[PDB]
Design a protein around this ligand. Structure first.
Ligand SMILES: [Cl-]
Ligand SMILES: [Cl-]
Ligand SMILES: [Cl-]
Ligand SMILES: [Zn+2]
Ligand SMILES: [Zn+2]
Ligand SMILES: [Zn+2]
Ligand SMILES: [Zn+2]
Lengths: 189, 190
């Protein structure tokens, strides 16, 4: 009688629908049951939810994250020299989306990694570029790349140095009064 | 009137001026006998000479250093994945001056590259210039901009202080092609 149907790959998240194979990828791309992990670095939070639930999750459970508005902002990371492994996290709203800016300090001497991810898909992220600048007297260091999508996350890119990477000596060249300004410009491409 | 005279600090390099102590500093700041070390990295050439002897030295003794003439050039450093300590050097001619571009690969579980530009000239001359180093890859760009160091300052202190373009062997793979790394060097007047 009927042909063989496939479960949606998000059946374990509650997705009841079964589909012919040709329709399966189309459906999973749009499935509201698709789970996303909390994108706030790094280990604490075990929340999972839908893509449209991520920004509300951040607003309700991570109140220390600020959200600036605009495509060209300044990310002031304060107290870059106070001891340990440390994270700074900020959201940036522009182009109808929210981008998360992360600066992570790792101990090795210390080094810093700065990266941007979009609360959105890879196909959406590929329409943007982000630029991180450090500005100092007669000095400028700039990184430009495509934002990571939250499904991809940022840990892999940081492991690969595929982001702005700089040491304590660099941070000191650019810091003022113990704080480091990072200019962040999101553009369409 | 009566006076105790002192030799210029560059007497050993040929300066025969002797002067009262109060005017010694004023002379030495403009004295043409001031020696400069060979600016070519890292440690093997011991030559020293006056500023006007530096370009003839590089041309006589360091013939494998290539020069490109232009304000906006591509420095192609070949074989960037060679292990250990490695230097690449070339000269860029523009605005009436010569600039030395250096890429240094150093080796703690961290090989890192340092790229920096020095003017064959004085600090005062270098202050009129800016340089931009850009690495370009697929949907990626890493840029450093700064004032070139003068050859009297050298580049060792800047490299020690990461006051230059600094990148590891992992991020280099984003920019390398065929095992080589193109660095765009643009010099401008400010
Ligand atoms: Cl300075
Ligand atoms: Cl500018
Ligand atoms: Cl001196
Ligand atoms: Zn589904
Ligand atoms: Zn969370
Ligand atoms: Zn003299
Ligand atoms: Zn020499």
């Amino acid at each position: 009688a009927n042909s063989v149907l496939f479960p949606c790959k998000y059946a374990s998240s509650g997705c009841e629908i079964t589909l012919p194979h040709t329709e399966k990828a189309d459906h999973e791309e749009l499935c509201e049951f698709r789970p996303y992990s909390c994108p706030c670095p790094g280990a604490s939070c075990k929340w999972q939810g839908s893509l449209d639930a991520v920004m509300p999750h951040l607003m309700h459970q991570h109140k220390s994250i600020t959200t600036l508005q605009g495509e060209d902002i300044v990310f002031l990371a304060t107290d870059i020299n106070l001891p340990g492994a440390v994270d700074w996290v900020m959201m940036q709203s522009c182009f109808g989306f929210h981008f998360m800016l992360v600066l992570e300090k790792q101990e090795k001497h210390q080094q810093f990694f700065a990266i941007v991810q979009l609360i959105g898909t890879r196909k959406q992220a590929e329409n943007f570029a982000y630029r991180l600048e450090l500005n100092g007297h007669r000095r400028r260091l700039t990184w430009e790349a495509t934002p990571r999508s939250i499904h991809e996350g940022i840990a892999t890119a940081i492991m690969n140095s595929d982001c702005l990477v700089f040491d304590t000596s660099i941070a000191q060249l650019f810091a003022e009064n113990g704080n480091l300004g990072i200019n962040v410009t999101i553009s369409m491409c």
